[PDB]
Ligand SMILES: *[C@@H]1O[C@H](CO)[C@@H](O[C@@H]2O[C@H](CO)[C@@H](O)[C@H](O)[C@H]2NC(C)=O)[C@H](O)[C@H]1NC(C)=O
Ligand SMILES: *[C@@H]1O[C@H](CO)[C@@H](O[C@@H]2O[C@H](CO)[C@@H](O)[C@H](O)[C@H]2NC(C)=O)[C@H](O)[C@H]1NC(C)=O
């Protein structure tokens with residue numbers, strides 16, 4: 097219709113059945129000379145009236161296409177790195193999902209000058225301009241309910257972008273959701289040390305040393321403590337947590353490649369094998385001159401200048417209007433952006449209409465209703481845990497993730 | 512040979528292949544008129560020289576046959592409650608395992624007077640007499656290395672029995688192992704509250720209420736606190752933990768039967784269907800007049816008089832001789848007898864030759880070496896966690912459980 101015909105995905109390799117929905121792959125113009133690769137998957141049910149949902153993966157420097165192919169896209173890449181299988185828990189069953197590779201240099205995204213050194217403020221402005229370009233390319237979606245969603249470092253990307261979107265009346269912003277998100281370095285660092293001890297990863301001798309060198313009375317500082325022995329003890333905590341063979345993204349999952357002598361314990365071979373196939377790149381309208389696809393761009397991460405230490409001000413600004421529904425959800429077995437840091441963060445916002453913490457349920461067919469996690473609700477904001485899920489909630493618990501997503505989009509209770 | 516021919520298991524129903532090892536099912540004489548049902552499975556490799564391992568399940572009132580058929584026996588009951596499949600991680604691959612239904616009234620065990628009201632001291636003495644009877648019936652096993660092992664409430668059964676066995680020079684006692692064991696009510700109750708908060712089951716409002724009503728400075732009393740509001744808050748913790756739809760035996764597992772409107776969240780139908788088959792009872796030499804088999808005898812539990820509050824004195828008595836190797840192992844996702852309570856307990860014994868806490872590894876074939884948990888070692892005693900396992904460690908992590916068991920029997924490092 098008004099959509100760009102040039103960006104249409106005709107026949108995607110590895111799919112045994114043709115999609116019932118239209119899908120597009122092309123470029124959105126960011127700031128300066130930045131060209132951000134998008135993959136837009138229309139809703140499987142009523143795309144014309146379904147909400148538009150932006151999805152951003154974190155890093156910084158990691159690809160949102162991993163969110164499509166391994167987390168909640170319409171089809172997921174199989175271990176052969178060739179076959180795609182339909183996802184019965186796809187977020188596009190009820191939404192027009194826009195997967196954006198951002199910032200420039202991530203995956204198939206690029207710049208004419210190839211200068212990928214960026215920062216939080218530049219990324220937010222470039223994402224805003226890319227969203228404006230999306231609405232110029234797909235004007236039929238301008239009035240649809242808009243939701244901004246993401247994972248991990250997108251805990252910074254999403255609220256900063258939402259603050260820019262809020263100032264634009266033409267965008268129908270209705271809410272935002274952040275999965276295992278970085279909301280406060282201080283809250284994340286402090287909660288992680290407690291998480292590690294209480295999940296049986298630190299011994300009583302190390303815990304005693306941490307209490308004596310990092311703490312004073314009933315308050316611990318595991319964030320910016322200057323005490324030299326506290327720093328040494330925290331280096332040991334960091335070694336046990338992420339550099340000893342434990343999977344930082346899911347404590348109870350195995351470490352891909354085994355305990356050492358792609359980030360540690362992960363394996364991105366399937367998605368990389370699929371996206372690096374020349375026929376897949378052609379099907380996705382990727383210019384031939386672009387370098388190989390990687391799940392995370394090491395150089396974007398290395399050159400990235402982190403600016404914000406907390407999203408407290410951003411969330412308070414977004415809640416001030418009382419126009420948006422906010423969700424922070426965390427898999428409770430993740431150690432990268434643990435659930436407690438985000439629960440502490442949401443509680444610290446001190447919002448009105450505080451509800452008692454309750455379990456939230458998911459029906460698992462014949463197995464009946466099961467506790468999928470816990471919900472702590474306030475006016476216009478809720479914090480949720482996903483019991484037994486790691487860093488990538490839709491990968492570990494796809495039915496619970498879809499159920500939560502459906503309740504979020506429809507502004508329904510999470511219970 | 513010198514073994515009782517009358518107790519031989521000829522053809523066990525549900526097995527597609529005949530066992531390569533000899534197995535027996537009969538009765539051991541306990542104290543008074545008590546007859547304890549045993550199921551003895553000889554080692555699959557060199558039964559004549561392999562150690563004799565007693566296995567006791569807890570409750571009190573629960574059957575050790577559930578340990579055989581669902582945890583670490585040579586064959587495990589399938590969901591149809593008819594088929595038995597060989598267990599490649601069976602503890603009898605390297606040991607002569609004696610599964611004893613104890614005390615009287617549990618499973619197929621009984622008394623001539625049918626009076627099942629008992630206590631810790633009577634149970635220990637009856638188990639000792641039953642062990643003496645085992646050696647009279649199987650004199651060929653008198654000189655074999657003897658290990659006393661068990662789970663949950665057997666955290667009391669095993670050390671109390673071991674104190675009696677230690678006084679008998681004719682029994683070749685070499686060690687004892689307790690899985691997710693009750694070692695101290697105080698340590699278990701205190702650690703559970705911390706476990707619940709740090710696993711995201713209690714909200715900040717409830718945690719604040721618990722800190723104000725149960726704690727004074729840097730010490731919390733969640734065990735025997737007389738404060739009325741502390742009791743009310745702890746009743747809420749107990750409700751969330753075990754009476755709200757969470758599986759107390761494995762936090763990340765579903766609740767069998769679903770979230771409510773056999774103990775809660777468990778399902779013993781397969782083992783019960785199998786053991787209640789009249790041909791199975793005949794094959795196991797069970798007298799026809801005995802009542803139906805149940806996984807846990809509700810009446811034995813109801814009438815049971817708990818006497819010991821801590822196993823501190825028993826373990827110190829057992830360690831005094833320096834003749835026995837002791838192991839306390841806990842699945843770290845169990846909430847019934849959580850890992851922290853037992854780690855605190857082992858550390859509180861204040862033994863010599865304290866080693867730095869380290870991860871212990873298991874090779875998962877092509878997946879390589881993986882962290883199976885953590886080991887805290889002292890002279891003659893080690894505490895181990897089994898990462899991602901619940902209350903029944905061999906059911907949840909059979910390869911890790913076998914590996915740990917092999918290292919324990921052979922007095923090898925756990926790493
Ligand atoms: C990393 O992931 C790749 C991709 O899934 C794994 O390779 C696959 O291994 C299976 C089993 O051997 C094969 O059936 C697939 O055909 C392989 N796919 C590809 C693209 O080669 C690989 O084994 C994983 N590596 C580790 C260390 O976990
Ligand atoms: C974040 O990145 C932006 C974009 O590069 C920086 O802003 C530019 O800074 C240069 C050098 O001072 C100027 O020449 C440009 O005109 C600026 N552009 C804009 C849009 O302001 C910004 O300084 C960076 N922030 C930090 C703190 O490093």
Ligand SMILES: *[C@@H]1O[C@H](CO)[C@@H](O[C@@H]2O[C@H](CO)[C@@H](O)[C@H](O)[C@H]2NC(C)=O)[C@H](O)[C@H]1NC(C)=O
Pocket residue numbers: 589590591592767768769778779780781784
């Ligand atoms: C409790 O356990 C029993 C025994 O495993 C379950 O019954 C089995 O269910 C499967 C699937 O429907 C059948 O294939 C088996 O033949 C059944 N076995 C028996 C002995 O009936 C039962 O579904 C479980 N109940 C709950 C609520 O989890």
Ligand SMILES: *[C@@H]1O[C@H](CO)[C@@H](O[C@@H]2O[C@H](CO)[C@@H](O)[C@H](O)[C@H]2NC(C)=O)[C@H](O)[C@H]1NC(C)=O
Pocket residue numbers: 629630632633816818
């Ligand atoms: C634990 O159980 C034993 C066994 O029943 C109790 O000991 C018996 O107590 C009765 C009543 O006082 C005496 O008639 C028996 O002679 C005792 N038997 C033995 C072997 O001592 C014992 O009192 C119970 N302990 C507690 C604290 O209840």
